[PDB]
Amino acid sequence: SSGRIIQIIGAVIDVEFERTSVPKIYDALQVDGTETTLEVQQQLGDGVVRTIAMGSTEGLKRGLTVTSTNAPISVPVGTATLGRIMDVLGRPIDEAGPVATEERLPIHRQAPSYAEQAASTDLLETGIKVIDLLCPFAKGGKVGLFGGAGVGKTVNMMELINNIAKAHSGLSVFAGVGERTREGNDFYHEMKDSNVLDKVAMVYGQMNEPPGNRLRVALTGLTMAEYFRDEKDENGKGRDVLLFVDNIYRYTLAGTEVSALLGRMPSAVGYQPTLAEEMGVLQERITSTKSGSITSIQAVYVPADDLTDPSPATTFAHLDATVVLSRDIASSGIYPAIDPLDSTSRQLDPLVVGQEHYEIARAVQNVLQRYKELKDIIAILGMDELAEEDKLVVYRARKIQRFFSQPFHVAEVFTGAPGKLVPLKETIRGFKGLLAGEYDHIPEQAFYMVGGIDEVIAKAEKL
Amino acid sequence: MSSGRIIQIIGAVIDVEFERTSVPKIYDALQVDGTETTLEVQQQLGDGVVRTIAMGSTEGLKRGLTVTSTNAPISVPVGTATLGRIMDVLGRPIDEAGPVATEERLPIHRQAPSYAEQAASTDLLETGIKVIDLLCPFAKGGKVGLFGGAGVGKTVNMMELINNIAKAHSGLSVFAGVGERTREGNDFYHEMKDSNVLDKVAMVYGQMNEPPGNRLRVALTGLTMAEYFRDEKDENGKGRDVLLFVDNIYRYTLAGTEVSALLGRMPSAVGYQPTLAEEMGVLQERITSTKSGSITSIQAVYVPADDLTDPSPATTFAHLDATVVLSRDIASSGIYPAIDPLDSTSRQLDPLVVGQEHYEIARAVQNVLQRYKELKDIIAILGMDELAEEDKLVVYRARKIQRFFSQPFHVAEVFTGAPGKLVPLKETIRGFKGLLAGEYDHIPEQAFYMVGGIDEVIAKAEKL
Amino acid sequence: PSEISALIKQRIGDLDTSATAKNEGTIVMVSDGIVRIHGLADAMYGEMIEFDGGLFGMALNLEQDSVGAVVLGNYLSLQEGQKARCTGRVLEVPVGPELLGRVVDALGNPIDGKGPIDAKLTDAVEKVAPGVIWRQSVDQPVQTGYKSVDTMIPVGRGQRELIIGDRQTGKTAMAIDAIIAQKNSGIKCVYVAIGQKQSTIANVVRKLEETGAMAYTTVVAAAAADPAAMQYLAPYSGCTMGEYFRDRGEDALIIYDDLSKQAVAYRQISLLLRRPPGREAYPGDVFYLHSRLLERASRVSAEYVEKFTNGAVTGKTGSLTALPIIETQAGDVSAFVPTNVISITDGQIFLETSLFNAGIRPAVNAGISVSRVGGSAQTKIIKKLSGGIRTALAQYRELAAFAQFASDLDEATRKQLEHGQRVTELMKQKQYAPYSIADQAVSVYASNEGYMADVEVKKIVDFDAALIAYFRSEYAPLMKQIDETGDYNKDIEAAIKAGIESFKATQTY
Amino acid sequence: HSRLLERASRVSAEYVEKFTNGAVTGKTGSLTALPIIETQAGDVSAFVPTNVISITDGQIFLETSLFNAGIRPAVNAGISVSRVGGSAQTKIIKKLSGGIRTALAQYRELAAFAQFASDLDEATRKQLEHGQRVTELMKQKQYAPYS
Amino acid sequence: MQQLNPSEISALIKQRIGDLDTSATAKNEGTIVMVSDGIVRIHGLADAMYGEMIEFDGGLFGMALNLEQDSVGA
Amino acid sequence: AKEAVDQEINSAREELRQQVAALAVTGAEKILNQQVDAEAHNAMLSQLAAKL
Amino acid sequence: AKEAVDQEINSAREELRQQVAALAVTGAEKILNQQVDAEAHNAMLSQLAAKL
Amino acid sequence: ELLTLARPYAKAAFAYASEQGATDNWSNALQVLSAAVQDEAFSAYLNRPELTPAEQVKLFAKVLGEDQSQAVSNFLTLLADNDRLVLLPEIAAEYEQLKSQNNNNVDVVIESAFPLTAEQEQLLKSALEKRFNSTVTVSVEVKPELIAGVVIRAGDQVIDDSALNKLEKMRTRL
Ligand SMILES: Nc1ncnc2c1ncn2[C@@H]1O[C@H](COP(=O)(O)OP(=O)(O)OP(=O)(O)O)[C@@H](O)[C@H]1O
Numbered sequence A: 001s002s003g004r005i006i007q008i009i010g011a012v013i014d015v016e017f018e019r020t021s022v023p024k025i026y027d028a029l030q031v032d033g034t035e036t037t038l039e040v041q042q043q044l045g046d047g048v049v050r051t052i053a054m055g056s057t058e059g060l061k062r063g064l065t066v067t068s069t070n071a072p073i074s075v076p077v078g079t080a081t082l083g084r085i086m087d088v089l090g091r092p093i094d095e096a097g098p099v100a101t102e103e104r105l106p107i108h109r110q111a112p113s114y115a116e117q118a119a120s121t122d123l124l125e126t127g128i129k130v131i132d133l134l135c136p137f138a139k140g141g142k143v144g145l146f147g148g149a150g151v152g153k154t155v156n157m158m159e160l161i162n163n164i165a166k167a168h169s170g171l172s173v174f175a176g177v178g179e180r181t182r183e184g185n186d187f188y189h190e191m192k193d194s195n196v197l198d199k200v201a202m203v204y205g206q207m208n209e210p211p212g213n214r215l216r217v218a219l220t221g222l223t224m225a226e227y228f229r230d231e232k233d234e235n236g237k238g239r240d241v242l243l244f245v246d247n248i249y250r251y252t253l254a255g256t257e258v259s260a261l262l263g264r265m266p267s268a269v270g271y272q273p274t275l276a277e278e279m280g281v282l283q284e285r286i287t288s289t290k291s292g293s294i295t296s297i298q299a300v301y302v303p304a305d306d307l308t309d310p311s312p313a314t315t316f317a318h319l320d321a322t323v324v325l326s327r328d329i330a331s332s333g334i335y336p337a338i339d340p341l342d343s344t345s346r347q348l349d350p351l352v353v354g355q356e357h358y359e360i361a362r363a364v365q366n367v368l369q370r371y372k373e374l375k376d377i378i379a380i381l382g383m384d385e386l387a388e389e390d391k392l393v394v395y396r397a398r399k400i401q402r403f404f405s406q407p408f409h410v411a412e413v414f415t416g417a418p419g420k421l422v423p424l425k426e427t428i429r430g431f432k433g434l435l436a437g438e439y440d441h442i443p444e445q446a447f448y449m450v451g452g453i454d455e456v457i458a459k460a461e462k463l
Numbered sequence B: 001m002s003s004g005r006i007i008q009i010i011g012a013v014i015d016v017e018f019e020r021t022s023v024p025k026i027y028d029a030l031q032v033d034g035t036e037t038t039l040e041v042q043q044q045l046g047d048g049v050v051r052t053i054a055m056g057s058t059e060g061l062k063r064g065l066t067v068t069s070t071n072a073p074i075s076v077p078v079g080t081a082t083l084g085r086i087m088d089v090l091g092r093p094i095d096e097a098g099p100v101a102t103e104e105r106l107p108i109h110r111q112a113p114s115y116a117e118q119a120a121s122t123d124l125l126e127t128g129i130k131v132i133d134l135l136c137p138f139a140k141g142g143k144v145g146l147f148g149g150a151g152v153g154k155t156v157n158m159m160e161l162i163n164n165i166a167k168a169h170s171g172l173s174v175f176a177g178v179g180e181r182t183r184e185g186n187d188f189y190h191e192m193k194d195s196n197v198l199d200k201v202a203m204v205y206g207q208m209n210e211p212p213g214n215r216l217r218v219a220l221t222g223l224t225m226a227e228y229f230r231d232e233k234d235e236n237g238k239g240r241d242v243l244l245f246v247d248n249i250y251r252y253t254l255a256g257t258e259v260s261a262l263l264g265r266m267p268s269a270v271g272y273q274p275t276l277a278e279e280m281g282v283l284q285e286r287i288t289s290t291k292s293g294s295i296t297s298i299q300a301v302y303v304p305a306d307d308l309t310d311p312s313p314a315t316t317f318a319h320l321d322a323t324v325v326l327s328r329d330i331a332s333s334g335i336y337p338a339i340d341p342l343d344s345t346s347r348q349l350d351p352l353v354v355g356q357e358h359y360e361i362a363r364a365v366q367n368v369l370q371r372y373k374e375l376k377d378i379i380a381i382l383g384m385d386e387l388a389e390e391d392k393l394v395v396y397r398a399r400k401i402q403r404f405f406s407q408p409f410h411v412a413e414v415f416t417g418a419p420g421k422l423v424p425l426k427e428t429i430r431g432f433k434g435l436l437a438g439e440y441d442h443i444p445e446q447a448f449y450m451v452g453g454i455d456e457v458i459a460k461a462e463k464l
Numbered sequence C: 001p002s003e004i005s006a007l008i009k010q011r012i013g014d015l016d017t018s019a020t021a022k023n024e025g026t027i028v029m030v031s032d033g034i035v036r037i038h039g040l041a042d043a044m045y046g047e048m049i050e051f052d053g054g055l056f057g058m059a060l061n062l063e064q065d066s067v068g069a070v071v072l073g074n075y076l077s078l079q080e081g082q083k084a085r086c087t088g089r090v091l092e093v094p095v096g097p098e099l100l101g102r103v104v105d106a107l108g109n110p111i112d113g114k115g116p117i118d119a120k121l122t123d124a125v126e127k128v129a130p131g132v133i134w135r136q137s138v139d140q141p142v143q144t145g146y147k148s149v150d151t152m153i154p155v156g157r158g159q160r161e162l163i164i165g166d167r168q169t170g171k172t173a174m175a176i177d178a179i180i181a182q183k184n185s186g187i188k189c190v191y192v193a194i195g196q197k198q199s200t201i202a203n204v205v206r207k208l209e210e211t212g213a214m215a216y217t218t219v220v221a222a223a224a225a226d227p228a229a230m231q232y233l234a235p236y237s238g239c240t241m242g243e244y245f246r247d248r249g250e251d252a253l254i255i256y257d258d259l260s261k262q263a264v265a266y267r268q269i270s271l272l273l274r275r276p277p278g279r280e281a282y283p284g285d286v287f288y289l290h291s292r293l294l295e296r297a298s299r300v301s302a303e304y305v306e307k308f309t310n311g312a313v314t315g316k317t318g319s320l321t322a323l324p325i326i327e328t329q330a331g332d333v334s335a336f337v338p339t340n341v342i343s344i345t346d347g348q349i350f351l352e353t354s355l356f357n358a359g360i361r362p363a364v365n366a367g368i369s370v371s372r373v374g375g376s377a378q379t380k381i382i383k384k385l386s387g388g389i390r391t392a393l394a395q396y397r398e399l400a401a402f403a404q405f406a407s408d409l410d411e412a413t414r415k416q417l418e419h420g421q422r423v424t425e426l427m428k429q430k431q432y433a434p435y436s437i438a439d440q441a442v443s444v445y446a447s448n449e450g451y452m453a454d455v456e457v458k459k460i461v462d463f464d465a466a467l468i469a470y471f472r473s474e475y476a477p478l479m480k481q482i483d484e485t486g487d488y489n490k491d492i493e494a495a496i497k498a499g500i501e502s503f504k505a506t507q508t509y
Numbered sequence D: 001h002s003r004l005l006e007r008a009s010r011v012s013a014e015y016v017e018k019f020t021n022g023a024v025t026g027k028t029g030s031l032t033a034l035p036i037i038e039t040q041a042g043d044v045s046a047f048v049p050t051n052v053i054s055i056t057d058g059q060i061f062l063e064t065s066l067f068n069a070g071i072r073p074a075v076n077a078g079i080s081v082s083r084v085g086g087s088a089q090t091k092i093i094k095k096l097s098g099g100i101r102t103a104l105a106q107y108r109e110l111a112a113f114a115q116f117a118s119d120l121d122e123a124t125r126k127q128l129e130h131g132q133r134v135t136e137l138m139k140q141k142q143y144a145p146y147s
Numbered sequence E: 001m002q003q004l005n006p007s008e009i010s011a012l013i014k015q016r017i018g019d020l021d022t023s024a025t026a027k028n029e030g031t032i033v034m035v036s037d038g039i040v041r042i043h044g045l046a047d048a049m050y051g052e053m054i055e056f057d058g059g060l061f062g063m064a065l066n067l068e069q070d071s072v073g074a
Numbered sequence F, G: 001a002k003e004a005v006d007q008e009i010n011s012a013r014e015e016l017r018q019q020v021a022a023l024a025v026t027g028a029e030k031i032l033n034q035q036v037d038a039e040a041h042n043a044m045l046s047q048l049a050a051k052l
Numbered sequence H: 001e002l003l004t005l006a007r008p009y010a011k012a013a014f015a016y017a018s019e020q021g022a023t024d025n026w027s028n029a030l031q032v033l034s035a036a037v038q039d040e041a042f043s044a045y046l047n048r049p050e051l052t053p054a055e056q057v058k059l060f061a062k063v064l065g066e067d068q069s070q071a072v073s074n075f076l077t078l079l080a081d082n083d084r085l086v087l088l089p090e091i092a093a094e095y096e097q098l099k100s101q102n103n104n105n106v107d108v109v110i111e112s113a114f115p116l117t118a119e120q121e122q123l124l125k126s127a128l129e130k131r132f133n134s135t136v137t138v139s140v141e142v143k144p145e146l147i148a149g150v151v152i153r154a155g156d157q158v159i160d161d162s163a164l165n166k167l168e169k170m171r172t173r174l
């Protein structure tokens, strides 16, 4: 009772079976010639099925026998994968020998039930000025990184990685999704020289494989994160784990590719109508739970800097912060180079962050946005013709921008790789003083490339 | 033997089979056996197969169920008793006050009026509202474009129109609610009732809670009602001349797009039905006057997206004859109605239509109102006394004009006391001409406000 | 112990009482919760269908030879060959006041982990609006605790009013806060959530529980992890529960979430049925789809109430007010779906991104937001006192450009500008802080009395709060009486003004 | 396009060395490619441009009017960038390019007021003059490359 | 496969079962098959010309548009 | 809190019944499988025919 | 308190499990009531299902 | 679908054969040709692209032997012209449906766990006669994997006595 190759067109495959013996959806189909594998997409009656090829699309012969597994796609999981890089099938692609474990789990579980949402919202700190002041995180949150091409975004993620690793036994995981493999290799080696791989797991989809593979890498990473969170350690509560999405947009595009060939009609942009279904399927399995939590970071690309179409629209209905990188702030020499005026979080709320921090954020928003709108007239005439009012405002804004300059903990070579991870409370103190004007008598340079008030004062005194 | 059985059902479209020796024609009426739903032949699919639409909900229905025909298009009750009655598209009472009294039934469809019956003359309807009566006179058997948002007294204006046409010209009134929202419909009913005018109008609503076919055919329903009343001859012949009120014809076009899409036919340039102009016309040509009787139309018009070049308003203007627009500011200035006497356009605005002197007078008024409008900004900014005293005279005279164009309404009598005043031309004309002569530049603006003819104005002025 | 053993045995002996001669079908084709089945010649249109796995399905396309039906539960469990079976019934869900404090599925199945629900009554989800003859006008107001809202945009029991705006604009917050204000209204409320993150859903749940108002309240949510059909039908079910009380002569409020989203789901479903697409892939009936839903909510003529009750109740009249929400792309109104929506509601409210970005909380643009129901949806006193705000806000919004200007302009313009700036700021408000109509009343009185036309703008909110507390303490019986009735009387205004001038004389702000 | 450009990159010396089966050891392999995309009315939202941009290492753009402004070549530095950065530049050129980029950014900043050099700041005028000079410095003929 | 020809009609099929040729007086008279919106698909007129006026038992006229292997659209 | 306790009690009280019933039906399946009575086959088909 | 009461109630479900095992073997005869008692004795012979 | 396409041809064939009473002959021919098209070899030989309709028609005549008719040949010709040869068996099936309903006979399919005796089969035939049909066509089937009982299917109509009852009790308990 083995099926055969009956029709192949590009990325869509069909097989005949004996009508009594019919494979169920989402179960693997074994090419009897090669290692290539097929996933069920829909059952075409008469023992006819439609499938997508996991692996190469070569060597294919009409009328070649193929067998099944009668079971969904399961790959090994567990601590025997940390610091190893796997394919979409969980095989060693790092030539580091085979995986050590046999703990294999399927990849199409259901979203966690309603009753098991973490009954309370949480918060996460990063020790980073602009973020922990203006982009708060909930443990279990959803984070978007928009734009940024004159700076090392991967450097930023790796900084967060060192943040969480030193901050918690909670490990980390990244998934290659349409990965610009140059940057992927760079990240791999730089994490390598960081000597931090024990808390990291690697799967790559690198713009070279049938769309299904790049679709499913996301599920793979999801599954790894799930299981790893579920390992309740010595207490009954496992570690809270972190995820890295190479790009959500490529996840959308993976399904977008062959949707029409699937017989699916186009959507409002020509897209796949199952867009929202798969999107929610993805997101709803990323939450905080009664025991443990899982959060993720999503490297976001924006087409032509346009957000007013479904592809980012659907995503936005699932994130919790919109970190939008800034290019000319990098041109201003700022290390993080993150815009301080557009990035937001839904987490900016006095009830969750306290009142003082919230109101400080309010005031800094106001001062920065007011300074921006005076740029033109300042250029036209000069500082003098402005009233004495807002001169201190200009100085304070400039000092704020300097204060945001945070030397990186892990670049290994940008300023010596010095970590700051300053407490939120100390930064609150410093920005409170600056808003009050406690130090509105010092050149902004003293606030540059440093952290708390102690560093600023020491720098100002040394010079 | 006309019983046919259901063969296929999707959404609202319905398919039946019949015997290849007895096949109903298109637009025939099918009553489902054992239920009160009705089917409408759209296109013969051969093999005794017909594709039709349903009229209402479609639930519980199952294939192979027998359905009969009528061998004829839809017919509804018509007659004198139809006034003060609200029926569906099928002409079936929904007021829940007994069945329809008449036994007279007429099919909904008929061909376009004959070229021979187009009356060889074109004259004007008399109204007593003193504004259209000068600036945008209505033809006899014309189409009046109406625009503006709600809350400006649209219902009120319709009230007064109905009152006048029924009173002087003994006109009969028919109103069709295309895509109606129930609440305002009920309010309009209660208004029909309190203001003692319900007894003279025939009412049918199609709600936006119904499949499109209902909404499409209420139009032809009311149309046929009007046709029956007009062709109903009076003593010595000469059946009445009647007015027709229809809401949001744009909704009509939208419902046409609906049914065309449901048929699985490709869209049009914007995406309307490609046949749009066909139904638009079919609506239009049955709106005219004849050698016997006449019909005139009032149609609520909404311009989606403010596109004067959109296909739907473009096709509308192909049949529009006069345009009337309603203002928000003017009403806020306590002037009622709030008709902008500067945007309203009439095809009938020609010395060959209203006569020579009337035409010139109207043109002069338009000039004065313009002139003052561009005066306004300077009056605001650079003061008032920095201008030509003739320009100031223009200002005062235009203010008098605006104060004067509003008037009490006989419908306003029950509203706020103050019984309205009916006024024809040849006094409005004379009074306005005298005002243009400046012979009344010795009187405050108040005598012109909430008042009838110039004789009344002078009476008040002397008494003021 | 042995109790259940007897219970299970006695229940069992009640079954296999006969052999059924049912008519059913079998599976031919499956794709994405969509199944083509063969057989079942006789079938109700839109019949709910059962399947060998215990799941259920909704039949839409009755083609001449087969049936297409959509999975209601979770597919990926069905294979061709398995046999369907119709229920001889249409889709039906339970209702009942016991549903309060309960959270269920769009099918009406508990999700609160509170066990089964003892609903004595179930009803078909799909019905028709009552006869237009059974409509009587709207006069009873509905309170929002939002001075701008309750002043310029009155809301009457049984009216359809639309909140609309762009994204992350607190629209959800607007709905929920409006819900909160129903401590004293005596009405009940239903929240319909569509395609949402269970996290957000649970946060709303927890917050409501903190308010405790989840006792005259019921809520159902079609989250983003749910079958599209579930989401599509859910608002109709919510409408069904509302109509329950409405037909009981009761008055209530319901709220939708993202009718656009459920429209999207319906688009996808229809598309999978190989139906002819419309503009932007939207089947035309979307207009019909929404409209047949919205009109089901209104305020009914008490005569209809009486006749339906068959004498059970005679005094009151039922009502149901509809508060839907639409999210927009960059504040467009020309999009097909919103365009359809607009002509349906009895009034609309916009949210402007910049205002909230400018920190204007709430960020409503009154400049275009209207309510064509007039003052009939306000109380007599508010009906009286709205006009000052109306005209001041007008004048301001025409001539607000002079902010930096008026260093040489005429004084009257300056005074009117200050008036406008102050009153504009007056509406800035925080969530979860509803204003009683008495609070709104004292604020408006102080406004029109100009007793705030002498204080700096930066502390207007502080001024107001202080005044609020001052009256609340000193003159509690007065506001008591006010919100008991809501009538404007010279004695009342004299007492209010005396209190105001005392406050000014007394402790400062 | 993906599987096309994906093939273009630089490899490890070990990879090729084993590929050559040890025939070569020292050198490492590399390959750079340049694709050309033609625009309609300079639109960027076009489908193929959208894709290719999403793929590439970065944009290099040229504006018509600049070629018509005599700017030959007519590079638009306002939008063309490389994620690679100075890492592929020698010490000296990276050392120098900074103030150049800064001046270009400044001049681009004051574009809207470029037609009103009568009431602005003097220092702003100096920045504009510097930008003008460096702009003209970016002119070059054809077939004439520079050491 | 593809949709049915709008010319495969049980009557016509049975007729060809009786005999294939001599259809409708060498196709001098045509019988209507498909009806929608002033557009008529007709079976059985090969003598008919493209662009020809078409007489009707209804006393009306038809315009020849599509001469096809099995049927004619007008 | 107390209501939560009650709900948990009820959840366990109902849950146990499910596995109990599963065990019972497995036993019933075993008994029917050991049952090899085609006499019962004849009797029951005759019974249905009578019901028919 | 929840943990204590649930753990002890759980501990009280095993004697109840054996009880209802007997009682479900007893209920296993109601398959005889499923029929018209075409079989009414096939179960009393069988006790091989003594599981849990 | 495919049945939908087959419909009209079945109608025509049934009408004609009934009008000639040769319905049995056409049914036999239909079975023959259905078996024929079932053959992979015969089809592949038939679908060879170098064959005008005449080739396939005469091939069908040959494989039919001395059983065809001029109406048969015309039918084959017309189907070959539009190449509807593929969906022939469904046409045959519908044709059987038409003869059954026309003669008012109903065909009934019964599966039993144990094999049956003609006594019981006649009893059931009588019983379904009391179900008020004209005549019945019984096709029995042994299904010992079914626990017991006889399951009877008349189109959409089904009656059960087997394991399904148990499934019902389990769902009931839950
Ligand atoms: N008046 C107010 N004062 C303080 N905070 C407020 C106020 N109004 C709203 N917010 C805050 O703004 C946040 C965002 O609003 P909300 O999430 O309701 O927008 P939304 O449009 O519902 O989002 P989405 O579009 O994702 O559904 C809320 O978390 C709420 O706490």
Ligand SMILES: [Mg+2]
Pocket: C171, C172
């Ligand atoms: Mg929301």
